[PDB]
Symmetry: D2
């Protein structure tokens, strides 16, 4: 393998798993093996939890500013090592070096940086009741929490989950996707290097149906934060609930609507549509995979998108000039391809791509071409279901109300967007679109200040923003009685 065997990270160091099993992570750009990775056993989960229980006590016993300084140090390291971490992430995800070098770690560290600064700002409340009595609340750490990551943005997700958790005074046990375990272990080394006490950020590798579930079930873990498919989320949330009533955050899937109004600049709109569909090779949960265009503009719009799509630079992720990589895994390419086939079979009109790219060494990698379907109907499987691949579904509408209604006609509610230049229409439409993450005349930016998460079946809770920090603490209310105590007995 390219790298030595990846071990478990528990208590500020690597330790041997006790499962006697490993799995491989595969570079999707060429099918080669990057590393063999240990599977955590049930007893390894138990070792990580006790490690965290004790680590958390040390972390919590420090002052607010002590925690803040340690996390700012981690940020400093992440900045130093941005390129190196981006390179590792490219190997593990297949994503273009152009994306990983400027996005994954940058915005990951951005969020940690944001929370690091907010540690001393976590406050409770005080409420006078009467002269002889008052209450004050404390916002205590939950204790030991667990994050479970997806494969599309491995270290970013690991940072967005562990940043608020740790900033709130908690220990997090983290499980990356089997598909992409590498950068998570690197983060753990970095946290330790920065001063994060042993046990406070532990990483367990393995499958979700094993270690994932062992985590969601463990009695001592107070909260699960999960990122992945709506279908899987439902199972994960059910188990966190029924085992010990854990608190939960769920960041799930979507089929996010982009509505392009007639008064939009069809150039900006096309840029937004492609960006909302083809960045990270279509592997972004918030993607605007249902694009609504007015009938009077379909033709023109279809022409601008095509022109754009044709200049997309598919190629080796290692190539600085590549801005569109292979998909993350071969089985996922197979899934995506299935969808594109469904499209064809359902008489959706193909506008571009529509097939695997095999020319040359591309055949050794999991490449799918940027694909666009148009003349779509709301009942087509490619329009109802999340593909999580490079597949845009263009849809035609006749009036604003009809478009909003259709945009909302889904069990998903992750993101939504409008392109218009009219003041009233921008706000009017956005207020009516049933999604947690809404964009006006843009797409995809996710500032650390902005709470993001889904409506309906796209999630529970939120990540980022001031609100997310509070949701990593538990409220304790204390009534102080200074006066006499009355009894009816």
């Amino acid at each position: 393998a390219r790298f030595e065997e990846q071990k478990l990270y528990i208590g500020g160091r690597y330790v041997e798993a006790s499962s006697g099993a490993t799995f491989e992570t595969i570079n999707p750009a060429n099918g080669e093996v990057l590393a063999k990775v240990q599977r955590a056993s049930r007893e390894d989960v138990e070792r990580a939890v006790q490690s965290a229980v004790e680590g958390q006590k040390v972390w919590a016993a420090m002052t607010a500013m002590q925690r803040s300084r340690i996390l700012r140090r981690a940020v400093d390291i992440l900045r130093e090592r941005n390129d190196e971490l981006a390179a590792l992430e490219t190997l593990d995800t297949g994503k273009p070096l152009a994306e990983t070098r400027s996005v994954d770690i940058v915005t990951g560290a951005d969020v940690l940086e944001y929370y690091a600064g907010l540690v001393p700002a976590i406050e409770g409340e005080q409420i006078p009741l009467r002269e002889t009595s008052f209450v004050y609340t404390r916002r205590e750490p939950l204790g030991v929490v667990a994050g479970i990551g997806a494969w599309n943005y491995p270290v970013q997700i690991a940072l967005w989950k562990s940043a608020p958790a740790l900033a709130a005074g908690n220990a997090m046990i983290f499980k990356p996707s089997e598909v992409t375990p590498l950068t998570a272990l690197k983060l753990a080394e970095i946290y330790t290097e920065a001063g994060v006490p042993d046990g406070v950020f532990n990483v367990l590798t393995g499958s979700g149906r094993e270690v994932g579930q062992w985590l969601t079930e463990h009695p001592l873990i107070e909260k699960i934060s999960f990122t992945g498919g709506t279908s899987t989320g439902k199972k994960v949330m059910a188990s966190a609930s029924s085992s010990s009533l854990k608190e939960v955050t769920m960041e799930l899937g979507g089929k996010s609507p982009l509505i392009i109004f007639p008064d939009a600049d069809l150039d900006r709109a096309a840029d937004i549509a492609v960006m909302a569909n083809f960045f990270s090779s279509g592997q972004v949960a918030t993607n605007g995979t249902r694009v609504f265009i007015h009938r009077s503009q379909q033709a023109r719009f279809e022409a601008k998108v095509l022109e754009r799509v044709q200049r997309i630079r598919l190629g080796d992720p290692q190539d600085e000039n590549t801005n569109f990589g292979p998909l993350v895994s071969f089985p996922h390419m197979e899934s995506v391809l299935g969808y594109i086939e469904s499209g064809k079979a359902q008489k959706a009109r193909l506008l571009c791509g529509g097939e695997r790219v095999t020319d040359g060494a591309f055949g050794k990698g999991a490449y799918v071409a940027p694909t666009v379907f148009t003349d779509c109907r709301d009942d087509m499987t490619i329009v109802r279901e999340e593909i999580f691949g490079p597949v845009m579904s263009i849809l035609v509408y006749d009036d604003e109300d009809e478009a909003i209604r259709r945009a909302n006609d889904t069990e998903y509610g992750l993101a939504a967007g409008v392109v218009t230049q009219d003041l009233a229409r921008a706000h009017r439409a956005i207020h009516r679109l049933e999604a947690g993450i809404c964009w006006i005349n843009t797409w995809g930016e996710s500032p650390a200040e902005m709470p993001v998460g889904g409506y309906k079946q796209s999630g529970v809770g939120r990540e980022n923003g001031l609100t997310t920090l509070a949701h990593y603490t538990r409220i304790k209310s204390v009534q102080v009685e200074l006066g006499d105590y009355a009894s009816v007995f």
Copy 2:
């Protein structure tokens, strides 16, 4: 039956259930049949959801102050009908008039009144990103939510759940306990009469394993708030998650510790202990059912408790002089009597009570004497397990840390309290107790301002206070882009 048949309440009026079935509700003081009550069918649930969906739109379209005035009027009617409502709650629960007249509606209304005032105060945030882009959040209503109530404070629970839901622009479908459906239907009448749009507060009667589960499963219901046992909550929450990823609030069971430190006034400590065990015949979730007393004060404390217990006025709940009534039902009595038998069998010393009271008219009802066990030990069933009846367990300890360790040694974590005259000990101890609701030198008061709920397996989320109101809304983040849009493609 005493009263005419009780029907469903949907869309501002009573409607016929479509199940073909009914159940009876019983006065536990004398076993009298109070009413035949209809069982909501699966299709009745659908009817109620569609009613709520449409009513919620009417309610949300009003202005903040319009909603506030309507809720305040509902508060006004409650004050008028306090006594009438108390009389009804007494019949249905067995709780003394002296409690229902001064606690249940008073404090149910206190919370509605609190939230009525805060409707106009619900706000989102605004964050500048750069000269050319900012974000604002909206706190939008969830839509339709479900409340599932418990039998011990039937109307107060419907109010504590319906107030924040309605104040935040939601509609709520409420299912009272099959054991005590009567006052919840009255609340629904009062809401309608106050101006609450039809469909905004609907009441469905029946069983939890049926109508409750149909509620937790329904895909158009965005949130469940549940009050009941920990075992039940785990099921409810699994159901709410697996079905459609609902938001959840859970107010569950407890085995809350009361630590009486050696510098306590033992008269106050005995008053506190008795109030924390025998109010509402011991049927209060936050009851301090494990009372820790220092070895050196055991005998004196016991004598004080005994003296107070002996003067407790067990009797007919319609008699104003009664301050201790029957349990809620015959099957709950049998449950409590079994716990009592467990305590005798495991060699706890019986300080007083310990049996059913059947003398005179009491034979017709479910009366269990206020009971005190002492010389208890941590491993005893009566100490480990929530009894939810008038059974106090006294436990001797030798030092402060020992007491705190034992107080914390439980899967519960609803409430906790200390009695001490020492400034440092008071706060030191409370800060280390793993419970959501903490009392110093008092017990039982639950101000509308004070967020209440459980640590650990005693709950998920909170009720009352500013924070709770927020958890009845969903965050929408809206990014406005005022400048150019950049595409990498």
Copy 3:
């Protein structure tokens, strides 16, 4: 005199002033003497102060919800007496009944209602320092505060000032303008009737030459809230500061810019401009008295402005059909005509009005015509100075940065507003305008939720919204030390 002699209001009743002096208030519509009004002596100020001190204790000893209910009862009485109070304010101000009936008391009560509901939401903070120490803050009432009202919205301003003051648990001594003293006395009666304790809202009649001055100087008064001219504000604040270090809030004057951009609907823009200029006969501090129109539209704009002005229904304020009344007083009419003179003298083109209206009955009142100057220039006295009367100055501009730069070129900064259909321009422009109150495509609406107040020399502090309530309490920080104390000596 139409009414009997008006007395001081101290301690829940009318009492005789001790000055031996009275002033008259005049109906500006017909010159009728409405009433003689006693002027407070210095000794009367002292008496009002002691009353407020003892009253405030009683008010503050209540529970939050207790204060809330009393303020809500005052709100109910105000709604009952809306028309009656409107009639009286119409007599005293000359403002049209069509205004006083739908605006003054309505929005006055709106704010009191809003604050009524927020009383129980006033909270402090809690902050853990370390295991052995934490801090909590209390928000304590200031004590006795002073309100100084203006003559353009007498009862509304009295409401907007006393509502947050009383809601935060203070007592207020209020001084209405000598010009409009009548309704403030009525509000005092109402508060008493609603349950406001004696002394908590005392009214002292007199002028800024005597009583106003005694209040700002009083050692025992903790805060001054002032509405009036920037010039008077500077004196008031100086006196308030140097005398005893008072908190001050000041709502002062303006010369607010209204920028019509080239893409604006001119019908709306004209609607906006006339409203922004002639409501309450131009007697509104936030009036958009500098209207920027693009050279290309100057012609079409003036036409629509002129068409609207000409249909203004100047007339007797007691006629429901009137929508434009006389000015508040003859001395203020003289001031306004003075400015109209200046505009003529300085060669500004007079589009309409420009003169005292004297036809028939109007000759006995203080009517001035809706006046529009155009072709104005930035150095014109009418363009730089606040007229506070029905006088719109239209300014031509060429480009967007120019209009903004010019809108900003003033020592004022109360309001500003833009008219445009463009999403980007609307926000981009408003963010650059240096005013505390900014309108997009509308004017004048001042929602209870919306903090209002001035940039630069247009004010200090704010009125309305959540933030304002906080400024009627002082912060006390409490550090609790539970651990050891360390000394270097």
Copy 4:
């Protein structure tokens, strides 16, 4: 002159004053002349203001995080140069190195570090009004603000004032005390080196009567924050107000009460009493200069105080073993000595100290001994007036209510504290004390998170805590109208 001549700091470098004048800063330990310092001329003030104006635009043009990173950079530099700055402050103030090394820069930087993390957290609000309209608020920088420093903690004060000002996106012009100009100039360098844009922090030296007043009078400065005597603050505030309605912060004098209740541990009480009187040689505004002791404990308490005072190590500020330095100047020393004489004159019993220390090298410095007066009376000049030197007045009392009434009986109200082991007394007593800064069983600690400032004549506004950052922005409300506009005309 130990150092070269000190120039004005403007626009990122030292520049020449245009006054032609200078003053000397002394060293109170030896009389040495540390430097000559140029007086800023009225035109220099004009210069600093225009520099500030342009710098602010640069600062504000950055992102929140960029600003954050720069202030964190500054913090790092301060930690490095902690000892070196300490040594300089020790020369310019006379305070023991033992203090300056561990307090002045440490806690100065603490506050900067705190606010650096909070820059991104500054947010406005969003308020829906109806389907067609909503408002949002922006918290914009004030612009240019001024700080006027005091001489007891020169660099800490400059940090506490500029930290929030800069974090909120303002430029500050700071004027050190003539008595202690050195460290302020060093901080200006440090900021510039950290990356703070030119103009954002400028230092002008000279008199308050002149340059102080020129700053408070300037029409382009938006706010003044001042620290010094109540007498002067009143003047300063009047000027800031009468000139242009500037927002103001005033941290002023006090005569803070310390109440030792009869259950207090006397050792802890004596330690607190001495820390509260003799740290920084008694030159701290929040000092407990009036110590109330119960009659029953007076003798034992005085004894314990004496024992501690006798072992105080007065000596050379340069020596590491000194914990009690000379006063800040010979003039200030005379003032203190005057007070000390008044005390002798009025027959207070001198427990110890009460004269200058002249033995040896001490005669070359402004050394007053640690002085304790006992048997004081409330009307003594030493009890009524702030001495600002090493003088403790001990006051006997008989009961709690008395002690609280006497504690409150003063026009000051900066700080207060109690010593007691009783939970109820501690909170009850503190709630009744009219001071902004209250300590329980401790004294002196001032967490970055804790808002600190005075009641009554001890101040206006606060320093530190979340609240202070907010008062360095101004609120703009924006109403967005998305529907029709209605005109009565």
